[PDB]
């Protein structure tokens, strides 16, 4: 029965080791992502949570018919 | 091109006001494209000095910029005097 239907215990051992490693990395990545999102929403200096401003190319730098401006 | 003549004759006999209005509207739509005087009107509009011409600082590399209003350089309005 063992020869025909099942395998050795080392197979399951190493499989669950790999599964545990994968899940641990995923958990760490999730926590790091939450922290990064919080920090970049608070500060706004990151790529995410960038809100549009007024483009400076719309300004007209020419004489305005009055000397002051 | 045969039935349209009869339609035009019937319209002129029955409702000349609409015929005249449509003719005037079409004429006003088409003609300004073919008129060579539109560019003259645009140039006349562009040649009207509403605001002050601000002088340019001389850096020594402006051959096409006059140093005085009576200098030969710069735009000329002689074409307007003959129009
Ligand atoms: C010796 C006589 C006295 C003792 C009798 C003992 C009775 C034991 C027989 C009863 C069998 C119990 C059913 C359990 C089936 C397990 C299914 C699965 O686990 O097996 C897979 C494969 O299946 C097996 O080949 C068996 C499949 C056969 C299904 C049994 C059905 C027989 C019922 C009879 C039906 C009769 C129909 C009549 C029609 C009219 C294994 O997957 P695999 O990853 O590949 O192999 C891993 C191991 N390796 C790598 C070393 C090779
Ligand atoms: C894309 C070009 C547009 C610019 C030109 C037009 C500018 C504005 C002029 C149009 C104003 C609105 C016109 C509204 C049209 C209404 C037509 C209509 O349905 O009235 C009919 C009557 O009108 C008609 O007969 C049908 C259409 C008649 C001809 C309409 C114009 C066809 C083209 C005429 C000019 C062709 C080009 C000029 C050639 C000049 C000759 C060399 C109903 O008659 P009632 O008075 O209500 O009742 C009568 C019974 N008691």
UniProtKB/TrEMBL annotation, chain A:
<comment type="subunit">
    <text>Complex I is composed of 45 different subunits.</text>
</comment>
<comment type="similarity">
    <text>Belongs to the complex I NDUFB5 subunit family.</text>
</comment>
<protein>
    <recommendedName>
        <fullName>NADH dehydrogenase [ubiquinone] 1 beta subcomplex subunit 5, mitochondrial</fullName>
    </recommendedName>
</protein>
<comment type="function">
    <text>Accessory subunit of the mitochondrial membrane respiratory chain NADH dehydrogenase (Complex I), that is believed not to be involved in catalysis. Complex I functions in the transfer of electrons from NADH to the respiratory chain. The immediate electron acceptor for the enzyme is believed to be ubiquinone.</text>
</comment>
<feature type="coiled-coil region">
    <location>
        <begin position="10"/>
        <end position="42"/>
    </location>
</feature>
TrEMBL record, chain B:
<dbReference type="GO" id="GO:0045271">
    <property type="term" value="C:respiratory chain complex I"/>
</dbReference>
<keyword id="KW-0496">Mitochondrion</keyword>
<dbReference type="GO" id="GO:0005743">
    <property type="term" value="C:mitochondrial inner membrane"/>
</dbReference>
<dbReference type="Pfam" id="PF14987">
    <property type="entry name" value="NADHdh_A3"/>
</dbReference>
<keyword id="KW-0813">Transport</keyword>
<keyword id="KW-0472">Membrane</keyword>
<keyword id="KW-0679">Respiratory chain</keyword>
<comment type="subunit">
    <text>Complex I is composed of 45 different subunits.</text>
</comment>
<feature type="region of interest" description="Disordered">
    <location>
        <begin position="55"/>
        <end position="83"/>
    </location>
</feature>
<comment type="similarity">
    <text>Belongs to the complex I NDUFA3 subunit family.</text>
</comment>
<comment type="function">
    <text>Accessory subunit of the mitochondrial membrane respiratory chain NADH dehydrogenase (Complex I), that is believed not to be involved in catalysis. Complex I functions in the transfer of electrons from NADH to the respiratory chain. The immediate electron acceptor for the enzyme is believed to be ubiquinone.</text>
</comment>
<keyword id="KW-0999">Mitochondrion inner membrane</keyword>
<keyword id="KW-0249">Electron transport</keyword>
<keyword id="KW-0812">Transmembrane</keyword>
<protein>
    <recommendedName>
        <fullName>NADH dehydrogenase [ubiquinone] 1 alpha subcomplex subunit 3</fullName>
    </recommendedName>
</protein>
<keyword id="KW-0007">Acetylation</keyword>
<keyword id="KW-1133">Transmembrane helix</keyword>
<feature type="transmembrane region" description="Helical">
    <location>
        <begin position="17"/>
        <end position="37"/>
    </location>
</feature>
<dbReference type="InterPro" id="IPR026626">
    <property type="entry name" value="NDUFA3"/>
</dbReference>
């Amino acid at each position: 029965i063992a020869r025909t239907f099942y395998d050795g215990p080392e197979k399951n051992y190493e499989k669950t080791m790999a599964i545990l490693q994968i899940e641990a990395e995923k958990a760490e990545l999730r926590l790091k992502e939450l922290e990064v999102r919080r920090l970049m929403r608070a500060r706004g200096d990151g790529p995410w949570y960038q809100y549009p401003t007024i483009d400076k190319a719309l300004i007209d730098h020419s004489p305005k018919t009055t000397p002051d401006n | 091109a045969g039935r349209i003549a009869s339609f035009l004759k019937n319209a002129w006999a029955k409702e000349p006001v609409l015929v005249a209005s449509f003719a005037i509207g079409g004429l006003a739509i088409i003609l300004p494209s073919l008129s060579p005087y539109t560019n003259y009107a645009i140039r006349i509009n562009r040649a009207t000095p509403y605001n002050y011409p601000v002088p340019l600082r001389d850096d020594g590399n402006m051959p096409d910029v006059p140093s005085h209003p009576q200098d030969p350089q710069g735009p000329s309005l002689e074409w307007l005097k003959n129009l």
